[PDB]
Amino acid sequence: SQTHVQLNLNVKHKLGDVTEFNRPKFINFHATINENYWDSANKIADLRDDLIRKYDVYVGRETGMIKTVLRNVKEDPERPGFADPDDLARLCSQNKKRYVQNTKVHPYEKYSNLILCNQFSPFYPDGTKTLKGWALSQKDTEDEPFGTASGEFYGRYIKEYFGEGGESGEPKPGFCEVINEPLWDIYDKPKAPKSSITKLFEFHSTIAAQVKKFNPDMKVGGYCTAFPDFELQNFGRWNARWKQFIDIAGKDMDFFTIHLYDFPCKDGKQMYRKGSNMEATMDMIEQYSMIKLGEVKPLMISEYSAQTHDYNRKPWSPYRDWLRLKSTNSMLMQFMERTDNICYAMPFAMLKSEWGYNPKTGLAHTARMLRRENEPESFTGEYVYSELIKFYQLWKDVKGTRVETNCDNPDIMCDAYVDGKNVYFIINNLDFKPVDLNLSVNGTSKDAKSIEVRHLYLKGGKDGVPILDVYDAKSLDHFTLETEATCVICYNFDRKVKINETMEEVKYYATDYLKEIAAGKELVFNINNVKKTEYGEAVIRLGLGRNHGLSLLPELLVNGKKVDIPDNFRGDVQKDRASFFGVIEVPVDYSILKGNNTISLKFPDNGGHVSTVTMQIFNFSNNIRGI
Ligand SMILES: [Ca+2]
Ligand SMILES: [Ca+2]
Ligand SMILES: [Ca+2]
């Protein structure tokens, strides 16, 4: 076959309160406006003007400055294991004054909404000494619960260092994550001590309270999961970690935070989160949050992209950047589908990291926006853009009101945004081969005045180069989207595009989750208080975590009526992964749904779990399909 992709530019796609592309939320990177790196060693004279203003790119996230203050602050004489309030204020006040004097950056504050976070040590109270020769208190009583001193430091740090902008000081962070990737240091890294997981989650509650004692309106979140791999140990990992975190600390967090990395080359193997896998990870967090807390917590993805194991001890290459680009684009498309429940998604790329270069090995930082002119041959010359800039060039100008798009291949993701006379049409390929697309654009009488095509793909296969092919077109009824590629098609119209209909997406959750599968035994899920309109469509989302060999085509009954499951689902079959974990998206005849709904699953074999059953309802303002 060939793939049909349809854009209905007169139909607004509403999800919760969101109807627009949020550039600050999505088009950003892991940096700050006041990094030293901006103003020296670069081929471009005013790099902030080029990267931040011209491309319209937002920031950021920063752990270094708070780490430095913590490691050099005097111990409290009146209390052992606590930072001294007067010296903390002193050091924080030195930094503030330096920010106050740094007037070149004050006009860039409007591009900045800081995610603040602590690196694991010395902040976690495990006894690790600071450079001043003392550890943070490891007490755990009802009067001084675990992390009280850590929390007081964090709380004080925020109150003392930050101002309101410009000559009053650096603006307060929009978000304060508790601690970076804590279970990686605690339990999973080689030679990890395996201290209490439970105590890490209590730690979060105690940090939040301490932070709010000094800054009552500051948002706090956790636990900043390095590797959210819920299906492991037959869902024991879920049970021991995210489940317990939600039970213990969920109610005290203003937001939840995780990291999501694809593994496109780990010992020659390809293990992806892009596609059905990350959908299952995110559905599970939301569904259990609904069951236990009665709400979906806003989700932050403070780092995402690919981790490139096989290339991480290699010099920089365009190819290594490509591996990151393809993961970033697909993940961003998936985050955009949940925009109402994502507060922030940040691709992991730093500006430069001149100090992350190791002179012994000759290895530069593996995710940089800028690299030296003579890399890979030598680490010399002035800094120029890496290939990672291609993401920000690809997404340039994209903004406006979201409009409905659909596609008959679940390995092809699409979306679109309308800004006055311009329309941005974004298409992403999850499949590992080229896909020939037929494009239809409906809802306008008049043809576009011009068309610009941006196509980001890999030339030359393995160890090749990414290309960003930008060209003008008078017509584009067909288009070949390359392997794992993305295109952004910008239509320019003579008159303002008229949006006169609305498709409202609403996501419904089940009463229960996480059910063992036994052959021949019905698993029944209940989704209630569903609101329908005369015209609509719907999708049922089956979260399945099963060993390979086991069936991903159960008999499905919705309110006693039979619904077919398609062969093809979103993304890959997960061959190199240890087991299958993913959401199979099932279209369902809208006429079958009602207020309370019975979803019944029967598999022919034993083992594994149905992690979640959720449902997307799409309610139309009119008969937009013409049925
Ligand atoms: Ca996990
Ligand atoms: Ca759609
Ligand atoms: Ca597929």
Residue numbers in the entry: 20 to 646
Question: What did the paper state?
Answer:
determined the three-dimensional structures of these four agarases. initiated by GH86 or GH16B, which generates NAOS. depolymerized by GH86, and systematically saccharified by the exo-acting GH117B and GH2C enzymes. exo-acting β-d-galactosidases, while GH117A and GH117B are α-1,3-L-neoagarooligosaccharide hydrolases.
BpGH86A (pdb entry: 4AW731) as a molecular replacement model.
